[PDB]
Amino acid sequence: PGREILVLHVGQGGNQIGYNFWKTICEEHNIDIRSNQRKSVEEDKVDYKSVFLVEAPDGFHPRALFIDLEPLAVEFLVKEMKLGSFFSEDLMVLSYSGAHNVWSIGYQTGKKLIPVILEKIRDTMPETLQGFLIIHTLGGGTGSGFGSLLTETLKKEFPGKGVLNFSVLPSEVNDVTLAPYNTVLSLNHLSRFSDLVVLFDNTALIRIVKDQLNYPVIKQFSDLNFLIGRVMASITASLRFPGPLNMDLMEMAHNLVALPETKFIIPSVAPLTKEESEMSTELDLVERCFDPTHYMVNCSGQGKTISSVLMFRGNIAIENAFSIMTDIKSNVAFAPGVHPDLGLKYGICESAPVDFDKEVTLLSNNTIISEVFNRVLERFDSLFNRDWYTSDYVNAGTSKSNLKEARDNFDRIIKIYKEIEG
Ligand SMILES: Nc1nc2c(ncn2[C@@H]2O[C@H](COP(=O)(O)OP(=O)(O)OP(=O)(O)O)[C@@H](O)[C@H]2O)c(=O)[nH]1
Ligand code: NA
Ligand code: NA
DSSP, X not given: OOOOEEEEEEHHHHHHHHHHHHHHHHHHTTBOTTTSSBSOSTTOOSOOGGGTEEEETTEEEESEEEEESSSHHHHHHHHHTTOTTTSOGGGEEEOSSOOTTOHHHHHHHHHTTHHHHHHHHHHHOOTTOOEEEEEEESSSSIIIIIXXXXXXXXXXXXXXXXXXEEEEEOOSSOSSTTHHHHHHHHHHHHHHHOSEEEEEEHHHHHHHIIIIIOOSOOOSTHHHHHHHHHHXXXXXXXXXXXXXXXXXXXXXXXXXXXXXXXXXXXXXXEOSSHHHHXXXXXXXXXXXXXXXXXXXXXXXXXXXXEEEEEEEEESOOHHHHHHTHHHHHHHSOBOTTSOTTOSEEEEEESOOSTTXXXXXXXXXXXXXXXXXXXXXXXXXHHHHTTTTTOHHHHTTTOOHHHHHHHHHHHHHHHHHHHHHHO
16 A cells, blocks of 8 residues: 545636546546446456545545535536536535635635544545645635645645645636736745646647647536646556556656755646547657647747656657657757756656557746746736735735735745746
């Protein structure tokens, strides 16, 4: 026993992403998410289901909690997707009042539910648990504020376990006017308490779906969130399936985090379709991952890579994975201090994602984060310098001085990334 992970889904976005993640995990392990059972003995593959799944005598269950301050997002999701016996009631921590898109309300109100969450965690977590994944959006109030609270709480309550965040940044035009406040407060909290923050934003995700998958229409968030689930599944694949070169959560974090503050990560995956997986080389897929068209954060260019983790899944030619490394280092811009021989961390897993021949997933610690974060900061300053929208932060325990303190720490992180850029 060991390597187990517990996933916390927080707020509307975090729980809706949870559906796609758990659907992917069950499919990869040939588990029927509706019966809780293996689909068959004959197609049961050699694997390690316990990373994300709890096997009980009756069947398999997610090692997850589904957390929100209002019940509708989760309840509607469970009904629509017929998840009632997988996203079961004993895994739900739901209130009634909502955070009303204010980080401070999510943080304060979430405090009331922390005892229940800790009891549920301590009720079912194996002692060998390797860490926690927190899935949330940063632009709303619950994912941002309650998710920040949970990041702080778990790091304090379970020292020695990893705390990783999968966090959705606001779109290029924000669809929550309060998002700059919520995003700065969240990123400040995660800089203090998270071990690694993997970032996404909907502008990039929509671009990928429309331009790489060519979906005719996006009618539900399930036709966006599958990309986040794919990253979460693929970067943990070598914990769950055989392969030549496996890596765990903190192994990946240690290879990425050059300085303690540089823990904000941009993910990408290639290819996006089965047809492309059958007509691509390892070199082509890695080049796609390092191209801004495939970044799941909206970026103006390639930036400068400080450090990267690449997971090769499936029908991978190991000699190609290694021989292209000089090409990667020559064709991709790395930060000035990165030695020509350094900056790459490899995992290789024999299991391809569903019906694909092969797939590459990239986690990049890239100086371009400074540009992404500077834009958030500019949005923040446009509100804060006018004292707009501050009242309900102040009324919920975040003073105007506190907002400024969070902004100034956020700026310090931006400047660290910019300094590494040269
Ligand atoms: N990618 C993605 N983004 C989402 C999803 N749901 C909401 N969002 C985005 O998340 C932000 C709003 O945050 P929500 O998750 O709705 O808010 P919340 O955490 O429930 O907080 P409150 O509603 O204020 O209590 C906006 O930027 C939305 O576009 C989702 O399922 N997937
Ligand atoms: Na909500
Ligand atoms: Na909402």
